[PDB]
Design a protein around this ligand. Structure first.
Ligand code: 7TS
Ligand code: 7TS
Ligand code: CL
Ligand code: CL
Lengths: 359, 359
């Protein structure tokens, strides 16, 4: 059998180099980095190299933190509940601006903050599937504690104007957080350009293991820990380090940014090839503005055949995709031209077959 | 070189079987268990087998949850901040009883809860290094939201009277949590016998990978999520599943409980052998009641030579241990009689050498 995987927004394959690099820390380098003895101190260099890779990936500076979390959900929960106690309660700034497009980690958390009597403005999506810089400026009260806008959307692949929203936040004196989960490895990410105070990411979206992520925290910005216990991560996030996944995620970031031109040049092209071809088969419109997107994602619709049906079919013929209904096909650098061609074929045949049962 | 590792309370070696079982999920079974397509659904059986192993390890029932967390720190933080909102605030039960002996994940969290105006009673340690059932009963007000007592202590290896504290909590109508991190794999753990509502554990203490743990939650007990986003873990703890570490931790628990008689019979004996022998070298008393302890841990003192000095020495001769000052030597099933003998030798020679520089 030979399966085609087009579900990169759900999760990605761990890069083989990433599997290789982690392996020694699952075998004989099993010491707790906190121990003083050799089993501990021996892990120190690989961890430092990892952190370094993470800093360079997002343009963090020495004076910033990139804190290791267990996933972007942790990161996101952490930013929101941290600001809740540091701003919303202790400083009266009882308002948070976000968008409707946000991942549930952000949205549900906000929902919880609402239940305690935080006022949350969920900026509405426009016709383009976007949010504009002016939209958040027009929403900032001076009780606004935080603006949280996702860098790129995982439904459509839509990029939002982070840089611009950054500027507004700087001018207005408001904490800015960007969930960048869907941007790492897909387009360049720059916390300096973004004037982010907080950035979250998750490794499994860029060929690292599931079960680890990061939160960038700008110099001098405070954020009450979500994991108290104050050992690890200059006391900001406690718990014995996930040594293998750290070493791994590090490598994952490095490879991810090394592939940034491949992503735009080749992956993007494969995505255009797929999209263009899908657009033929009679009555198939694409969803969203097709300019401001990460290179890897396309969301096609099939006229009067719910997505689920197309996908269940595609699954049977060994092509994995998901909805966003519409059909979300999302690529990685591990897709090939052959696989796309095949997808065009099997997609169209599937379309055909389902039209005919519809009669 | 041939190193001896006696720092099992810091962390343990991933069991080779555990490394084997996780491996396929780092290689080709990389699908998100939430996907509907084959890459997702194919992970379903291994995950179910894992969870099953976890349930049986602690005697959880079908009607309970064993929720997968990123570590015991997550678990502990989760219980405390969960009860804070569900009991302390929403129900006025503004008091928590714990002990002084607790791991910092519990203690620091409590410290934070104090800062919001929760009243926390930190039960004092006695001469035995213990806490008695009566001590917590005498502390329960009817504003008490939660009792949190650690099952076994990682400093001395001291077991606390969980079963008894359980009974008191049941009688008194109070939520009971036990951090069992230092008990899994060391003595039998039984949430039913314990009348725990909440139990935490962490895999790296029983030959699983760092970076994953569990919280047992009793049937019908509520606990507001620490990770909102409400996808995974019947919405109790959100974030893409750490598939490999889950499969791994599962195996780790199984092997851990399979070795329960080996642990008491052989590991315990090795520990007694080591202890007895150390007790000779002139002026070396052991620390704590030497009856109510997990089999693997001994905490010896050397008269007027701070622990750190003994350890730095021991490190040079390739024996890894830590303080608790006193010297904490903690064993696993991977220690051998040879290694202990060697330790007796090198320990005593080290004692000798440091006496003579002391002059
Ligand atoms: C933009 C974004 N934010 C946060 C997360 C959560 O990261 P995690 O904590 O590692 O799970 C994801 C991935 N989540 C999903 C992508 O597709 N379905 C999902 O549930 C994401 O795409
Ligand atoms: C009793 C207990 N509770 C909680 C933890 C925290 O588990 P983690 O979240 O997986 O780190 C540990 C391990 N911690 C340590 C054992 O020795 N030094 C330690 O810091 C522990 O022994
Ligand atoms: Cl918090
Ligand atoms: Cl919470």
């Amino acid at each position: 059998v030979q399966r085609i995987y087009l579900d990169n927004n759900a999760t990605t394959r761990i890069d083989p180099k990433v599997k290789e690099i982690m392996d020694p820390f699952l075998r004989d380098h099993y010491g707790n980095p906190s121990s003083l003895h050799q089993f501990g101190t021996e892990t120190h260099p690989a961890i430092a190299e990892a952190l370094d890779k993470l800093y360079k990936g997002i343009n963090a500076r020495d004076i910033d933190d990139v804190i290791i979390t267990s996933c972007a959900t942790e990161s996101n929960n952490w930013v929101l509940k941290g600001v809740y106690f540091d701003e919303c309660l202790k400083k009266g700034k009882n308002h948070i601006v976000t968008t409707v497009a946000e991942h549930p980690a952000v949205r549900s958390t906000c929902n919880f903050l609402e239940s305690l009597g935080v006022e949350v403005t969920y900026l509405p999506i426009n016709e383009h599937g976007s949010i504009t810089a002016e939209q958040v400026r027009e929403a900032i009260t001076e009780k606004t504690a935080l603006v949280s806008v996702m860098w790129a959307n995982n439904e459509t692949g839509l990029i939002f104007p982070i840089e611009e929203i950054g500027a507004i936040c700087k001018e207005k004196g408001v904490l800015f957080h960007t969930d960048a989960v869907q941007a790492i490895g897909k387009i360049p990410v720059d916390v300096l350009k973004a004037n982010a105070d907080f950035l979250s990411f998750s490794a499994h979206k860029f060929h690292g293991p599931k079960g680890i992520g990061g939160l960038y925290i700008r110099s001098g910005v405070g954020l009450t820990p979500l994991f108290h216990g104050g050992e690890h991560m200059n006391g900001r996030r406690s718990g014995t380090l996930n040594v293998p996944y750290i070493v791994g995620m590090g490598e994952a970031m490095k490879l991810a940014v090394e592939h940034l031109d491949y992503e735009k040049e080749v992956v993007g092209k494969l995505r255009d090839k797929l999209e263009e071809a899908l657009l033929k088969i009679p009555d198939v419109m694409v969803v969203g503005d097709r300019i401001h997107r990460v290179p890897n994602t396309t969301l096609v619709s099939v006229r009067g055949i719910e997505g689920e049906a197309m996908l269940w079919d595609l699954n049977r013929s060994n092509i994995a995709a998901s909805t966003g209904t519409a059909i979300r096909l999302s690529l990685s650098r591990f897709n090939t031209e052959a696989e796309i061609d095949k997808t065009i074929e099997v997609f169209s045949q599937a379309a055909v077959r389902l039209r005919n049962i519809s009669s």
